[PDB]
Every structure is written in structure tokens, then in C-alpha cells.
Symmetry: D2
Subunit: 409 residues, 4 copies
């Protein structure tokens, strides 16, 4: 086990190293505790939900098991966070379909969130259903298919409004559609006009902003839908800005070499807010667990340096069933927090002045030196201050949870 | 030398092959006639211009030489086209800088365009000048630098309005800025806010759309400016939609594997018009001569299939000084025209129906068969009908122009 | 329907256009006749095989798959080959991958003989309980390695037997899924286990006239994204050092990577290639091959540099969203017309112009050739080999749909 | 200025944190000492050289360039090496690339001995009238080919001489620009011309104790985008078959390509690697090396699989927008701290966990190690080797600017 005295000693020296270069480590930690991460429920049960019943043991099979697993992960993540629901995580003994869901079907999660002390975000479920016709939903050329998914869309807003009212925290309602073509399309225009019309119909009925606002998630390509995506990043950025809604940036859904941290400063002169879905793509939209890599470092430092956190909701989105599913959440959440914290531990005001004076020598030297400053000592202090295990130690908690809970399922 | 009667005969056979699948070759050729390509003047003199005085022989060094070279290229490109000027192509014996150019400095090109029977598009020159400070111009942190380039931007609009008034054809005034950083920036927000404020000042003074409209050209990266581009594709699409201006898509300026033909149908539900700069990137923004490849085939078929040509200006943008510079124009122009014509020779209405009906088997079979239909016979007929040489034959014209003009320089 | 005399007339005009630039269309069509494509059997039944239990009409039995391949080959002009997978064994004896016998392929030998096609082979190193954590031949578990080495050796014995019976060398292609989903600690040891296992598999000598092995690398696959044990570098090195063939699958490389670049860097050192034409759409998606930059460059790089006599061309794709028989024909025809376009260029003169650094002539002529009447030569090739021209083969597909594919699911299996 | 006591206190805590997970920080630092980086001379003078006559203070003479490399090496902890180019010959004699003599490098042999560093070498096959249509050794023109083959042979004679005088093997790296701007018709013949020419260059036997050749491929370059005669495949094949070294330049591969994948596919067949660490930003841009995914993966792949003893690590970048001496130090320190972080992992235990398919433990530990106190071990290494800690070496740069660079 890490000795708390070692943490305190390392922190006192780190505090002085940072103070020497004009950085306040105590202030950086206060800034970090103001950034809630929206932990996605679907990593716990391989996106099965409850509506329509070499993988690691101990998958959650019930609301109680999934709630318990999220409680365990949150207990190992320092600070206070949020949970993202999917529509298929409805808890009810009533026979429901996606077009007949009712807000009270989420009373279970409202009660859980109040007891756990977390806010809730929402996702409509526009996949894994017989009404998905040729990979299309809201923007299907089939009117019956459109109407079914438009009803689910409107219901996602009603559920979100209800949750937001009960919780007293705004529910970000994220729309992701699979709609697209496997092979090269003739008509790229009409599907996007069908999408535009359908989305306008979904958001028409006004709901209190204090309770919910919608975000729209584009994708470049998906398995079986490689050649064309109706809901493109350009379509949704244009839609978000014109309809005054949020734009969802999923770090896994762009071109090879594409840096999503570039988009923030091109959006905020025109738009309202972002839902930043941190996700690790490995050569495709693979939904690997978020790790501390160039992409995460750039996302977190671009939000911190340019002051966009107050208008950017950070959500996790990944699905890895090859490892302990509770551990997956903690790895991704801690990777995101330590990357935000490293960005907050820079003399940003002074680095900005140096850059304004075109002192590119100083900027290169200092940014490179900061990568080996004692940021880990500040992160360890943050973990310890918030009653979470330091470094390797939380593996003990996972091993105990496996023995007592997961391996017994 | 190809025989006119044999071109006519091969056309009659192709006309019947196409008629049998519900395609009218005469109507396809009439559609191609209505698509003017904006031929860039700067390929003729390696972007030297006239304002501020190993490779293929015969570079143009004077207005008369460049005017003559463009006349020769257009004489080998069938139909009616346009020419793009840069501000540095001003023709005047007065001492000028970029912030003191006057509309009359382009009387030479107005007079030439009238005689040649072509319209003119325009480009402000925001590069190769001592006032480019650390690769920044309009969005420089230095107010003196900003104010200089804002004067040039306003002047570009005044010139463009004057040319448009004199020719009775709208001048598309294209803005490209090099502004960015070689290495990783601290502040991505402020440069883009400086750009937004400076562009708004440039376009403030009202001018009639009849004479001129501005287009905004983004870039991912350039040589010596690799890490950050102030004027991003997202920034300019947002800017164009917000300020009711045109958006410039340069085929060479996107990510590896990025398909710019995807963007049109995501723009036109929101925006006014496009300036499509066809350009061949080979692994970077290399500005190779446009050839008939996947990118050009996808750009041209996406414009004709979805009916965007009436709102899309097509310009050439490439620079290859390793080959006959006049030949470079004709290769690129002809590649673009035959690609448009091939797209126009598809049974688009029936293919759209098959696709709406999810007959993806029919769509794959027919689109693949069409690639080996006799589109060549229709292209040859188009060349001959418009008094240009067929196939290899225009090499004789290039060899004669080399002997008589280029090799004597 | 296109009229034969019209095809004949357009061909005469095309022949003259090409003759005027020093290209012989009759000779180009004779050259294309000599390039057999190895049509992959597994597109017909979604890689199910017969060993282990969306568009209509999937093949469910040997006779159904044989019929579907016959139908596809009847619409592809010229003489071709078929690739088998080990799981396409035909026997009532209970078999595992480590107990297959050469005679289990007598069904396919007899079919190939009467169809007039050669056979290529693929060992099956996937969809089996003995795939342990995505690893087979190069598993750290010696019991798993030993099982897959037994299958490897058997693939060679089967291939040797088929080659003996057909009197045509069987290319026996090895593809392993082996790798990691996430970032590995040890990249060296898996590749040493792979090297040792492959050397054991190829140890027993078999006559080259009957069979030779090819080795197929991959950059990444679904659920194995971060590390592939059998990399392109590993297998190019392995093929050259062990004097075997190297398999290049056009879908298995980096974004923007041009596999047509590899041939001329391999052939100064190596024996031969198995070129697997496949269309990747932003990942290893196994789309049907179409006439695109990649196929045009692969085919023209093989033709221009004279590599066809040392390069086996196979198809590898899997699209079950469309008529599975039509999938084969689209891909085969796209590959043939792309080869034919490359053969219809004044290659000797273009080479001389390039050696003289006349890049102007090279650019103008290569661009003009893209709109020469290559279609008229392709149509003539189709007609001469008793296959429908242009859109016409859709009639054949529609007939096969009514008669076979739209009924098949209701037909008793046997 | 950082207090040595702050470095010592942080180090003692770091040493305990690493010991608790089976990692010896003292041993990790001893391992790092054994990895010399070959510092490229051409960053100091924008690849001008002396044979054929932006931030202030460019080196313009051999003494200025030598002084600048001394200054950079004084701020990089441990013992390293310097890479020369043929155009850095120091002689009063009129030379061309085909008439250089070994003693034209006596200046650099003497400097290397005084400095206490080994020397690697690069033939110069660019920026010369005899570069014809972007081709040199593999030109279709026999006059061009023969000129560049002579330079190739001389590069080996020079390398052998330097190696004999220093008592340290000179890696002689070959990079050719040869290729086409636009799409070629014949891809085969250029590569056969290259094969024959390289075989002629390496024909005359020279002692391996003095020098060995390495061959550097490229995917594409400016004005040569469509085809590169000397491809990565061509040179890996050539190195393995002719028993020479293969040069991997981190800036010269495809978008998303991980050059750290190549080592374990090479070493079952090949002799050795020259690894050129270089940062590409969307093309072969030759940016200063920084601690990024590419550098982290390169360094940890060499450390984890035990390839350092068969892998020469060289720097290759050119950034004239910043202090050129600082450029060397940023790049060298980034490479060293990345090697050190890789050396500070419980590699033997992580390998066992991975063999047992415990991918949960592997993910958790590799992520935790990224925020272990690796910086405290790096600072101790800097201090132990008499170099400034953290931001402090900027004082040295500012003093060197004041006293030397800005006075030029
Ligand atoms: O809704 C959960 C996620 O499911 C994946 O399949 C989609 O690609 C989106 O990333 C989405 O956010
Ligand atoms: O090596 C794995 C172990 O490392 C120790 O340092 C931790 O306290 C945990 O017990 C963990 O399970
Ligand atoms: O041709 C048969 C197919 O026709 C399409 O129009 C239908 O959508 C189904 O895909 C059906 O199986
Ligand atoms: O809903 C299932 C149907 O999906 C279509 O796309 C397939 O082509 C088949 O017709 C299938 O029966
Ligand atoms: O339009 C589709 C049809 O085109 C005709 O030209 C073909 O002969 C086939 O009948 C095909 O089914
Ligand atoms: O010769 C020094 C370096 O110069 C660059 O221009 C080349 O691309 C190679 O990377 C070479 O190693
Ligand atoms: O202004 C002419 C052109 O110059 C350069 O190519 C720029 O990258 C951009 O494409 C611009 O349009
Ligand atoms: O076995 C047939 C094929 O199956 C999969 O597509 C593999 O990725 C590989 O391409 C192999 O050749
Ligand atoms: Mn997402
Ligand atoms: Mn995803
Ligand atoms: Mn442009
Ligand atoms: Mn460009
Ligand atoms: Mn394959
Ligand atoms: Mn594949
Ligand atoms: Mn290099
Ligand atoms: Mn480089």
C-alpha cells in the first residue's frame, strides 16, 4: 500500500516546484473538483439494457447489479460525477417498446442518482431494434420507420425533462443515429434533408432548458455502414448552431490523424455548448477504454487553456468486455482527470504572453519540461484528499469486488 | 490525327448504348456546356505576379505572355470558362503595395477578359510579403499587421466589385490566409476571435452581390505552419453560413482519406454557395495537376447527382512547374469536364429510385458497368463540337506552341 | 439487350483508335485470357463452411455453393480458379481441423475438374474453441500451438494432394488472427513463437509442382486492433528467407497506403506473390472490389512491370447485404476491365518517354487513355467468352433469384 | 533555480514508490547511461555545411558549429555521439562530393576526441547540380549514377578512417531523394538500378570494427510525392540480404503508422537498426522530437523487448524558428526521459501478467505508471550528470544567446 506520508512528502515538494514557476497546486486541485465526468452505464452490461433481454466474468444482468457496479467504480473515482443512461435501461414491469416508454420508467434511476449524489444525462436508443431498416431510423425513406423513431425521439425529450425536474440538474439528451449506407450512395442530399425535417419535428415541443437540452452526435463511419453517414460532423455542427442546441464530439468518430481538440475554438464563436465524448479509437471506432495519450492530453489541455470547461460537458464513451468492466470505468475516468489536472498545472497566463510575443523557443522548452514535472504527486494528493486509493492500490478494491460480487454472479 | 467523321460515328453508337438505359447524350453535353471552370492565372508564372518583381522552359514573365498562355490553354479546353486573378497580377506603372492597389490596376485583365469572352474571379494576396509576421496577417496579434491586411481585404472587395460591374458577371472574391503556428499553440481561441473580428471589418462596407460575393478558404496545414491553422474548415463553414457568404472547399486541404464530396449535402441545408477548388494532394497539400481519380470522380458526381452545380463555382488550383505549364491547365480542365460528363451520363433518376427501394445490388452492378460505358465517345464529340482537338491530338498544339512561343522565351 | 453486331462494330472502331497510338487490342485481349482470378468460395455462404454448425439465398450445402460458384463463373469471361477454406471439407466422417484428410476434398477436386478451374487453399485458423485469446499457431499455450501446427501441416498435405490430382500447383495461403486488442508489453516473443511454429509447419518437404505456401499479414482486425503478431514486415521477411510466397491483401494496410508500391520492392529479393484484391472502406471492411484508384494501380503496376507470371490474383471480400453471386461477378469484372485498361496502353513508348524525363507527355497520355474506348474492348472480351455485355448480366442474376435464391430458404437441406 | 535538496527529497520518495512495485530506480538510471544519442550536426547551420557556401545566431563556421554542439551536449546528461554529413568536410582544398578525402574530417576526429564522443556519418546525396530529376545513385543517366556511386564509396572510406582513428564503429547512413513527383510507368527498373548501384558502393570490404552502412527509406518528400525509389520495404529487404543496418526515421511513414511495430518483425531476420527520432506534423516536417505517443512507443518498445544494444538512436530534425542549440536539448531530453519512463516499469512482472492474459492488470498498471514519479528519477539523472533541472537550462541558453549566438 502507498504510505499517506509518502503522498504528503511528494506533494509538499511538488507544490514548491510548481510555485517556483508561478503555478498554484492547491488552486489546480480546486479547479479539477469542478469538472464532473458523465460515466456511461452501458459499459457495465455490454449495452444489453433491460427493455429487450473471451468476455470477462461478472457482467451486470439486473438494474441492482448495474447500479452496484457504477457505485463501486464511482467509489474509486475522486470527486463528484454524473451517469449517462440509455433509453433501454428503463426499469418497469410494464410491457414497453421504444415508442411507448414513459418518464416514470426511470424513477428507479432518479432514486439511485439522488442516493448516489450524481446528476444524470440521457441517450435515446436508435439501434439494436427490428425497426432499424437498412441501417436507418429517423431519416429512413420509409415513413412508418421515420414515424416510429420520431416518437422515440420526442419521448427521449419528455423522459429527460422529467429526470431534470426531479433531480434539479439539467439532463443533456444526446442523439446518436446509425443512419447511413454500407456502399456508395447516389443521393447524399435527400437523406440529410429527411434528417433535418425529422430532427426539427423531434425538438418542436418546447421543454424547460433548466431541465434538459439536446446534443447531436455525428460519426464518420461504422461497421456495416462504412461509405456514408447521414448525420455527419458538418451536418450536426451546422444543426446545433442553427437550432441553438449542443454539439457532441466523440473522440473516436473522426478521420485518421484528425485532432478533435482543434474543433472547440472554431465552434464557440458561433455555438452554445459541447458534449465531449472521450473514447479511444484504435484504427476504427473501436470504443477502447480512454487512456492518457496525445488525443486525451490535447482534448483536456485545449478545454483548460481556452477556458471552455463551463460550456463543455465531458462524458465517457467506450465498451471493453475483455477486462473487468468496473475497472474499465476507473481507468478511463482517472486518465481523463489526471490529463485535466496536468493541463491545469501549467503557467497558462505566462505561456500565452510568451506565445503572443512569438517566443516559440520558451513555449517549446517549458511545455516539454512540464511533461516531467511532478503532476503525479498532485494527482496522488487529489486521490488521497477525496478518499480514493493511490496508484496501483485501487487494484485491491477491484480484486475484493471480484471475490465478493462479480465472480459469484 | 483523329477523323471528325469517325468521332461523329462513334458518338452515334454511344448515343444508342446510353439511350437503351434511359440516358440522353445530347442533353448530357448541353448540361456540361453550363459548367464554367475558373482557370487560375498563377500556374502560368509560378505565382510571381507583376507587383513585386531545374523547371520546365517558357515561364510567362509579362502580362502579355501570361495572357497569351491562358488564351492558348482556353483554346484547347472545350466550352466557355472563367479565369481567377491574384491581387499581385495588378498591371500598372504606378508604385503600388497591397494596401494601395486601385480597381483600375486591373483594367488590363477586364479588357483581356472581354476580348477572350470569359468572366473573372479574384483572390486577395495574403502571402509572400514583409508584412506577413510569424505566418500571420489578418489575425496577427500585432495591430499594425492586422490593419495593413484589413486594408488589403477591403481593397480586394473594391477591385472585385469594379471587375463585376465592368464584365456584368459576379466576381467570386476568395480569401485564403496562411495564419497559424508551426508548433503546438497554447491559445487556439484568441487567434480565431481576432480572425472573426477582422473578417467582419473587411466585409462591413455594403457591395452588391450582383458584382461580387466573398468566399472563405480553410486549410488543415501548410509547410512551416503544420500544427495549427487559424482559418480552419469548421471556422469558415460556420463563418460563411453565419455571414451569408460562400465557403471554399479545396480538395487538397483535408485529412488523409477525407472525401470532400461528403461536405456539399451537409452544407446546402444551411448555406448559400460553394467555391470548389479542384486540386490533387499527393500525401500533403502538394498542388498536383487535377487528374481523373476517385477524388475528382466523387466531387463531380456528388455535384451533378444532387443538383448543386447552380450554387457551386468550380475553380482549378494547382501549381506544377515540372511540365509544360499551359499543358497543366488543359490536363486539369479536361479531367474535370470528362468527370462531370461521366456523372451526367448516368440514369440518375432510376438509380435514385433503385436506392430509395434499397435495391443496393442493382446500384453496385449499374454504377460499376457505367465506368466502362462509352463515355469517351461523348467526351470526344463534346471536344470536336466545341472546336478543340480530340484525345492525344492536342499534344500537336502544345508542341507547336513550344516551338513558336514558349521555347523562344 | 446489346446486339452482338453492335459490339463487333464498336470493337473495330476501338481497335483502330488504339492501333493509331501503337496499341494492339487483339493482343491485349489474349494477355487478359492468361490471367486467372482465384474466386473465394466463402462469399457464397458467409464463411460458414460445412465442418461446424442478410440478402436471401445463402448457400447451405456443398451442392448449393458449387451451383452458386458455377453461376458466377458463367458470367465471368475466361478461365479462372477457386479458393477453398479447410472448413469447406465434404465428408460424413466427424472431423476437426487437426483430423481433416486430403480425401475430404475429393468433392471439390471432382467439381473443379468438370468446371475447368484450378484450386487454391486456405487453412482455417479462426471461429474455433482452440482460438485462445485471439491466438493460434503463436499462442503462449503449447497445447493450443500444437493443435494449430497439426492443422497447418494438414493444410499442406491437403494442398499437395489437390495439386497432384488437378495437375495445377495449389497456393496454400496462411492467415492467422493472432494479436492483442490493447497495447502489448512483449512484441518480440509472439513473433519468435510464430517464426518457430511456421518453420515446424513447412518442415516436411512436398513437391513444389503440387503446392507452395503463401503468408498473409494484417495491420489490425476487429477485437484485435492494437497488435498483429503476423505483420506485413514479418511475413515479407519470412517469405523471402524461407523461399515462400507473400500474400498482399489490399484491405489490410494503413490509411492512404498504396499496395501497388510493394511489388517492385519485393521482386528483387522474393519468389512470388498472392495478390488478394479487396476494398477497404476506412477499415478492413471486405467490400466487393470496384474499379477505383487502388484496383487501377494494383492492376497497372502488375501489367507495366511484367509481374503477372509471378503474381497469383485472388479475390477476398464478404458482402452479404447484396446478391452474393452478383458480388463475385462485380469484383471479378472490375479486376478484369482494370487489367485490360492497363494492357491497352503504349507501355514500351511511355517507358521511353519517362526515361527521357518527358513528364508532360506521360501526364497528358495517361490521362487521355482513361477516356479511350477501353469499354469496347472489354465488351468484345465478354462477348467472345460467351458472357453478357454491360447491364445484360442483371437478367441472369434476376433469373437465378426467381429460380433459386428467393426459394432456397424453404427448400429442405441435404 | 531548483534546489538540489528538492531533487534529492523527491528522488528518495520516488525510489520507495518504485521499490514498492519491484522497480529499482538506481538500476534504471544505470541503464539510461548506456544509451548514447547521435546528435545531428546539421540542425546547427540549417544543413548549409562548409563545402558549397529564422532565429538569430546560426553557426557559419566549423568552430561556431563545434561550439554550439559542445553547448548542447553540456546540457544533455550522460555521454552521446554526433552525426556528420559529408558537406561538413573541413579543408582549404577545393573539393566536390566525388573528391572528398578521409583527412578532410581530421577536424571532427580531433573535436570528437576532445569532446569524448563517437561519430556517425551521412553521405550527402542532395542540394547538388548532379541531382538530376530528383535522382542520384539510381538515375537512368550513367554519368549521374557513376558520380553518386563515387560519393557512396568515399562515404565508406571516410567512415572507415574515422572509425579506425576513434576506436568506435561509425554507422554510415545512406539517404537518397531518388523518386518521381508524379505517377511513374516503370516502378521495377529504378529499384533494380538502385540494387546494382548500392551493391557496387558496398563491394570493397572494410572492417566492421571501423564502420557499417545503414539504409534509410522514405514514403514521400516535397516535389517527389508520388514514388520513392528507396522504399522502406526495399531497404529492409536490402539490409537483411546484404547484412547491413536498416534506418527507421519516425517521420517517414504513413499517417497513423507506428514505427515501434517494426523492431520485433525485423530482429528475427536482421542485424541492427539505426533509429532516427523525428516528429512529423502531417508530413515529413522534421519538427523537434517531443514526448508524444510516437516517442513513448518507440522508446518503450526498444526497452521492453531488449533491443537497445542492437539499435543506434539518432536525432533527425531541423527547426530554425527557435534557438537551434535549445532544439537539440529539447529533442535529446525528450528521448532520454521517454527511455527512462520505459525503464521504470516492472517489465518482467508485466510480461508474466500478459502471458497469463491478465489484460485488466496490464491496462491498470501501464496507465498508473504514466503518473508515477518518473520526473523525480529524470531530475536526479540530470543532477547526477551535472546538467540543469527542469526550466533551469533556459538560463544556460539565455547566457549562450547573450555571450555567443546574438553577437554573430
Ligand atoms: O450510444 C452509445 C454509442 O454507441 C456507439 O455504437 C455509437 O458509435 C456512438 O458512439 C454512441 O454514443
Ligand atoms: O502488483 C499488483 C498490486 O500492486 C500493489 O502495489 C497494490 O497495492 C495492489 O495490491 C495490486 O494488486
Ligand atoms: O431483391 C430482394 C431484396 O429486395 C430489396 O428491395 C429488399 O429491401 C430486400 O433486400 C430483398 O431481399
Ligand atoms: O428484414 C430482413 C431483410 O432485410 C433486407 O435488407 C435483406 O436484404 C432481406 O430482404 C431480409 O429478409
Ligand atoms: O435497367 C436494368 C436493365 O437494363 C437493361 O439494359 C439490361 O439488359 C437488363 O434487363 C437490366 O435488368
Ligand atoms: O540527411 C539528413 C536527413 O535529411 C532529410 O532531408 C531526409 O528526409 C532524411 O531524413 C535524411 O536522413
Ligand atoms: O491563393 C492561391 C492558393 O495558394 C496556396 O496553394 C494556398 O494553400 C491556397 O490553396 C490558395 O488558394
Ligand atoms: O480467410 C479469409 C480471410 O478472412 C479474413 O477476411 C481475414 O482478415 C483475411 O483477409 C483472410 O484471408
Ligand atoms: Mn459517443
Ligand atoms: Mn465510438
Ligand atoms: Mn485553393
Ligand atoms: Mn493546395
Ligand atoms: Mn485476404
Ligand atoms: Mn480483409
Ligand atoms: Mn532521417
Ligand atoms: Mn524527415
Amino acid at each position: 500500500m502507498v504510505k499517506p506520508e509518502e503522498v504528503d512528502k511528494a506533494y509538499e515538494v511538488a507544490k514548491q516546484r510548481y510555485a517556483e514557476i508561478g503555478v498554484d497546486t492547491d488552486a489546480a486541485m480546486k479547479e479539477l473538483e469542478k469538472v464532473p465526468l458523465s460515466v456511461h452505464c452501458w459499459q457495465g452490461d455490454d449495452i444489453h439494457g433491460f427493455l429487450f433481454p473471451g468476455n470477462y466474468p461478472g457482467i451486470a444482468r439486473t438494474p441492482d447489479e448495474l447500479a452496484g457496479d457504477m457505485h463501486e467504480a464511482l467509489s474509486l473515482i475522486p470527486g463528484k460525477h454524473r451517469v449517462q443512461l440509455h433509453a433501454i435501461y428503463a426499469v418497469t414491469d410494464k410491457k414497453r417498446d421504444l415508442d411507448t416508454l414513459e418518464p416514470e420508467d426511470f424513477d428507479y434511476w432518479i432514486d439511485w442518482a439522488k442516493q448516489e449524489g450524481v446528476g444524470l444525462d440521457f441517450n435515446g436508443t436508435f439501434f439494436s431494434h427490428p425497426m432499424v431498416k437498412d441501417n436507418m431510423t429517423v431519416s429512413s425513406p420509409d415513413p412508418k420507420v421515420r414515424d416510429f423513431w420520431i416518437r422515440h425521439g420526442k419521448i427521449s425529450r419528455e423522459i429527460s425533462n422529467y429526470i431534470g425536474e426531479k433531480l434539479g440538474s439539467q439532463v443533456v439528451n444526446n442523439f446518436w443515429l446509425p443512419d447511413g449506407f454500407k456502399d456508395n450512395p447516389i443521393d447524399k442530399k435527400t437523406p440529410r434533408l429527411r434528417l433535418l425535417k425529422a430532427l426539427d419535428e423531434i425538438i418542436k415541443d418546447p421543454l424547460p432548458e433548466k431541465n434538459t437540452i439536446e446534443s447531436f452526435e455525428g460519426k464518420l463511419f461504422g461497421t456495416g455502414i462504412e461509405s456514408y453517414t447521414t448525420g455527419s460532423h458538418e451536418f450536426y455542427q451546422n444543426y446545433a448552431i442553427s437550432r441553438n442546441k449542443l454539439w457532441t464530439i466523440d473522440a473516436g468518430h473522426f478521420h485518421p490523424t484528425e485532432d478533435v481538440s482543434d474543433k472547440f475554438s472554431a465552434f464557440f464563436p458561433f455555438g452554445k455548448g459541447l458534449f465531449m465524448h472521450v473514447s479511444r479509437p484504435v484504427r476504427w471506432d473501436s470504443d477502447h477504454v480512454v487512456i492518457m495519450d496525445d488525443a486525451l492530453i490535447r482534448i483536456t489541455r485545449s478545454l483548460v487553456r481556452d477556458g471552455y470547461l463551463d460550456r463543455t460537458h465531458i462524458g465517457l464513451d467506450f465498451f471493453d468486455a475483455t477486462i473487468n468492466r468496473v475497472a474499465a470505468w476507473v481507468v478511463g475516468a482517472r486518465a481523463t482527470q489526471k490529463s485535466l489536472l496536468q493541463a491545469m498545472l501549467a503557467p497558462i497566463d505566462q505561456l500565452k504572453k510568451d506565445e503572443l510575443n512569438a517566443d516559440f523557443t520558451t513555449r517549446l522548452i517549458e511545455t516539454e519540461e512540464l511533461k516531467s514535472f511532478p503532476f503525479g504527486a498532485v494527482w496522488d494528493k487529489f486521490c488521497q484528499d477525496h478518499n480514493t486509493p493511490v496508484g496501483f492500490d485501487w487494484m485491491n478494491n477491484i480484486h475484493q469486488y471480484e471475490k465478493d460480487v462479480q465472480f459469484k454472479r
